[PDB]
Design a binder for this molecule. Sequence first.
Ligand SMILES: [Zn+2]
Ligand SMILES: [Zn+2]
Lengths: 303, 97, 52, 88, 365, 201, 215, 179
Amino acid sequence: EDPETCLQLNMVYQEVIQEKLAEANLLLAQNREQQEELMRDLAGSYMGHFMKPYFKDKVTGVGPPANEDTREKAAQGIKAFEELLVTKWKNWEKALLRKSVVSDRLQRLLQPKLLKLEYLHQKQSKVSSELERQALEKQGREAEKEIQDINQLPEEALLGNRLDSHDWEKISNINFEGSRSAEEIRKFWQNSEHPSINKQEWSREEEERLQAIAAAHGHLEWQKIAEELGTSRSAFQCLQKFQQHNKALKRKEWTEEEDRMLTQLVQEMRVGSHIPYRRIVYYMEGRDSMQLIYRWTKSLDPG
Amino acid sequence: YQLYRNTTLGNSLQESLDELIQSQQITPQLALQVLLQFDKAINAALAQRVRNRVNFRGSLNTYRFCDNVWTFVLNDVEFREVTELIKVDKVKIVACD
Amino acid sequence: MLSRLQELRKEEETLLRLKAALHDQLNRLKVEELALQSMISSRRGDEMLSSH
Amino acid sequence: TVPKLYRSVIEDVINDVRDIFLDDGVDEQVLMELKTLWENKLMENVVVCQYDKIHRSKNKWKFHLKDGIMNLNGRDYIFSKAIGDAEW
Amino acid sequence: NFPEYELPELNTRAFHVGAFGELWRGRLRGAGDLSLREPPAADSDREDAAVARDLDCSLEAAAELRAVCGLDEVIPENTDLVTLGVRKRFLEHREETITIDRACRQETFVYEMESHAIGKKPENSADMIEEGELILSVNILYPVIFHKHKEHKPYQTMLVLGSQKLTQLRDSIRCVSDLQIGGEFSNTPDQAPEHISKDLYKSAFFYFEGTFYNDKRYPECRDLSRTIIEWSESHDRGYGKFQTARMEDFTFNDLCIKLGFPYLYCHQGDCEHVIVITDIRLVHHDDCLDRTLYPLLIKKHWLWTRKCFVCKMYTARWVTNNDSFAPEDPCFFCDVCFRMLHYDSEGNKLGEFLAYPYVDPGTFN
Amino acid sequence: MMNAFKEITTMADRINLPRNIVDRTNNLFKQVYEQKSLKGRANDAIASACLYIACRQEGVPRTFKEICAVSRISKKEIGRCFKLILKALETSVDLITTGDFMSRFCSNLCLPKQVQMAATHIARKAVELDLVPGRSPISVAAAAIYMASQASAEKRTQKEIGDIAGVADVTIRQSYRLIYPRAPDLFPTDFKFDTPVDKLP
Amino acid sequence: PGLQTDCEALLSRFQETDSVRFEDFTELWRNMKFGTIFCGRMRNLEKNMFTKEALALAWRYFLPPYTFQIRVGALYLLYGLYNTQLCQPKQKIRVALKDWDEVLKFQQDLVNAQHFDAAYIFRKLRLDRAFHFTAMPKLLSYKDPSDRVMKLITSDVLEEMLNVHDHYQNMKHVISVDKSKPDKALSLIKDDFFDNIKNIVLEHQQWHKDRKNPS
Amino acid sequence: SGIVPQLQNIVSTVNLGCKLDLKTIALRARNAEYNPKRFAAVIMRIREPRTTALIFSSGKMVCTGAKSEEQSRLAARKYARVVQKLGFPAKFLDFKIQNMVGSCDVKFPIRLEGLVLTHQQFSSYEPELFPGLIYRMIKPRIVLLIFVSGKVVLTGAKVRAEIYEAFENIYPILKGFRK
DNA sequence: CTCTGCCCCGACACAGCCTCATACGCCTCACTCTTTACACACACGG
DNA sequence: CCGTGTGTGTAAAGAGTGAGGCGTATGAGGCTGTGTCGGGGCAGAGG
Ligand SMILES: [Zn+2]
Ligand SMILES: [Zn+2]
């Protein structure tokens, strides 16, 4: 009858279809947001970087400078966890240390004679004489003979006497990969790894002699004990053997006060059915975790 | 090598050798071979005695290169040696390869 | 997780095709709307010849 | 770490020049007094060192120096390497 | 703000914890859902009436829903499913390969450590935690005490309480670095122990998404973050816009942090721990309801205990360096062996060495 | 003038390429030696460039790395001499399309013909869909072959494809990520496989 | 381990019934002895871990984009699992904030559609306080889905589209000044809209079936 | 179109008019580069114009890096003055700009394949060697590096007008091959 | 058959853009045998 | 009938390699240019 009805009907149709596009375009936006989330998942990436150097340069990889508190703590000789970090000596490490010490001693002994030979050759180059040149040649032959004698030096006389100043810091540079400090290497070589330290298994007579010497001379001068033991042993080894064969190390008998102390420690440090005995033993005098386990399981638990 | 005989150590070497030669008890030769073997020894040890990591940042003021020797001059530099910082207004770096 | 990726992308193509069809629908609808406006102007101009 | 490095260098140099001192005809007393005067005399910021790679960016210089010595603020320091950065 | 993922399954967006708790409490406001009370024919009628009111159904409908929806061990198991069959095979293998079949130390430790305080009713009746308190299951990374800590990073989980002021967790984080004793006792080991590091260095700071909350509570405390911010202001460092706080005027609710994202906790100069907020949840009725001890430990790593190198029977009391007797440089001794080896009868420092008190990380942590 | 035709024949022998390509290479060498617009260049480099040009013209183009892998010179001078010869001879060579390099790359690998066609379709539909804008066709072919192998019964990791096509594994990774989301629609409609195409590394 | 498959089977064996009543889930539980999934010698630590894993699996199956039938089956599975636990401190279902509104709307839809069984199960799960209202579903450190097409186009949507189209054609027929023919200015109306959308939807259905059919 | 290239590099040459001892310049210059085993020139760098000058023993200096001819000439004069202060009779003779390289972006991806297909006689496109198409323009002797991202680099021009005319000549073709 | 001086070349920068392709390395993950540690247990012998 | 002397389970180190992702650095390309040092054909005696 009149297009006005057409106008209004088309308005309402456009309204409904535009609402349909509104819903559909919201779905499209959600789907594209999901796709962007997935892409960033592909581009995503950690904890380890933030262990000691929570802040580390994107250029160099170093942390913030030592604070005044850190410097004061270091001044008081308080060790960081890295300083107190101890690692076992592997057999390959021991062999490498031995060979490295041999090579270092060879180089140290060769350097002086090598430079002497070089100086003799340099003097020969500009001597402006013949008889003096022959004398210099004879001296060079003597130097070469000395170098050859040094080269053929046996390992026994080459190693040293476990107290001579080697350049142990070298052992920590070329042979080792920096995992071991110079002090650690030198102490290990001087005290334990040197051939002048008897690493052979202890004999019954040797153990008896060690016990007798410790009893007589006392258990408090173990250096003189090792010296008097006769065999080439370190004070550390003698003390270790004495302790491992000692009988007064542990009390081996329980008392009422000790029982009360153990019960108090257990009740204080329990977390339930779990009883960490190694941590209890810290306050316990002259006791082992096994003894505490036995006492708490057999004589301090109602049944 | 004519590079490491300029620090406090090398200057001490030069001064001690000068005092000894002026005392008329060593010859200049022994002095110069001693200096050469010192150069060799410091080259060996300095490259073989050390592991402390350092990292420095600054504003390079000037630089130079000739006959295989670099000469940098930097301003407002901070050197970062193990767990400690050194701030220097101006620093000269002389390298020789 | 690519199975969900392919399901999502196929749904994306589905809804893109639906949007393309409906956008053609709206473009032609608006063309019709302009035609209606022109025709109603022309028709209403036929009774304005006698006014106060 | 610098004092121990200097002591080691002194020990090495004196030990390996002992042979020349003996050969040329100067007694070891001269050698030991040289040592003693050496430590006695031991007691501008300049860095004498070795360069491994002087990388040049557009204007950023990345300095990969090998081992070297620095004389910063009247105090001697030593490094095995220096990975530094600068802007020209 | 709503907690939403930054990374796919690794990290969330930075949001205010207080707003998160407010949203949760408003969406559960007056629903009977936040009770914190112990679980409890007349009550059947009331339950049916409540069901009818909530579900728009008749009383008979509520009664039949209650009846039909009713609830619906014995080690023997037959007619096994997939998972049940796998479990049966695993138990058979364990029985045929194990001889004692008793709870191992680690499993009992972990279980009793997690379930140490669950449903533990407070004694005072005055430390009530409000209905909804946003308990944070934080975790503190253990400091590297053994070289292998890098391969597997140990951590201890702490159920902190929302709205609790900072320094409540800092005073609760148990670390061996706070018990270290400074000074050298080589000359004589009977010196009066110096004040533990907890007293000498009271300073510490948290760092949560570019904000240094410094522990300036005590006069002995100094601004630990200062250095860092200064060292950050010198040059472009990749870190910018550092903030500062006092750590005593803030609560965990006020923190705007992410979940699963590394944050820092520094103490005792440079002892750094990684704080990670695993998740945030409203307090339930089946967990600890206290406040005096609620900042407790949910899990700890049970570190190894160092032993005297001479005798392996006892733990370590002293650490010696540059010793003329020990094979290694950092040699650990007990009191007995240390006294026996490092001194004479009348009493004097034998040989050359530097001996210091050693606190076992495996005992106070 | 001699010792280059022998060198050209030796160059072809290592690739087992038909003789007509060798004849075309010799003819191109003759023309370039007549022009002498690149006299300073070594004869071996000219021969290698002529071999590459001849291989390109016949419709079985190779890659510069596969001419260098047989030649005694580096790819840099091979490309320099290629451009110099193209300029001096006032000749033209059709652009390399991805379709050329699968018939050989898949032949060196132990993939079946079905996987060959699948990879060809993937690489093509990728190139028309502009999923790999301005990237070397060899890398696109490597990525398509990687998809075809991973989805098919015979699986090849990136190292084998990189060695065969002479494309760094990182380049393969990048070109695979770029067309990674659009993997399914690139496969042929009728394609059988034992590992679903809806899951891939 | 490998519990997911079992749950899937249950869900499958529920959706195959095309039912929402909780009773059918009860007979399925009794037939498969699902309550025995926790039975068997196993210690408290791994017991609570396994309960946590099962509850998390059931909850994630209960959330979208799974079908309504699968969602109700997952809700019933959650109820059965939580009510049948051997841990003294019954493990709680971890519920996130972003999902709370969706679950509330799902419950509203369930009650509106007279699915009073699932509504009562959900209300009971709320009352006994079986939900840990966490920030994210899991601890952060370091199928039968629903497609958008049904939400876009369905039976009623196309029915009302075609009704509007028919009304539009009739009003076109009546608008023209002459009943013989409509005006030439308004003759662009298309009849292929329904045909086009039908072709597109059947193309999607064909793709889906040839996908889930293995090669 | 309304977009014009912005110059990125200008290479110019000048004759100082006297032989130089490169060793002295290296030892006395503030920022000189001299490695005789590596190259036979002294490379001096300055900050104000941000240019680099290679000075040869024969007295010919080559300045690069200037973004426009005024700065190139000023930098060349600065280098000449610096050499003069070093005790050399250096002058400023025969200053010539040898190259002017600029970059620009047409702001739409380009189909290189079709471009080379329809313009083979000028363009050389080798994706394996260089992922950019090389168009050897013939009216001005300018080389164009065109990339799929739309970046176009003009090189080989001696004056700025050559760069502008080359870009205006190439723009319609790129628009016709708009991807 | 075997060198052998000789003029006409290629290859070093380094100036600033620009995209893809190639290579180095560096911190962290995996796992795997091998011990390592700590609680608990089972005899064991007269 | 209460002592001890060896066994056992199972997570926790300890190296011991070995792999892998990603960030950075490098190359390749025409550009036009200037010193210079190797060097690749070139016929050429010379035997
Ligand atoms: Zn700590
Ligand atoms: Zn001891």
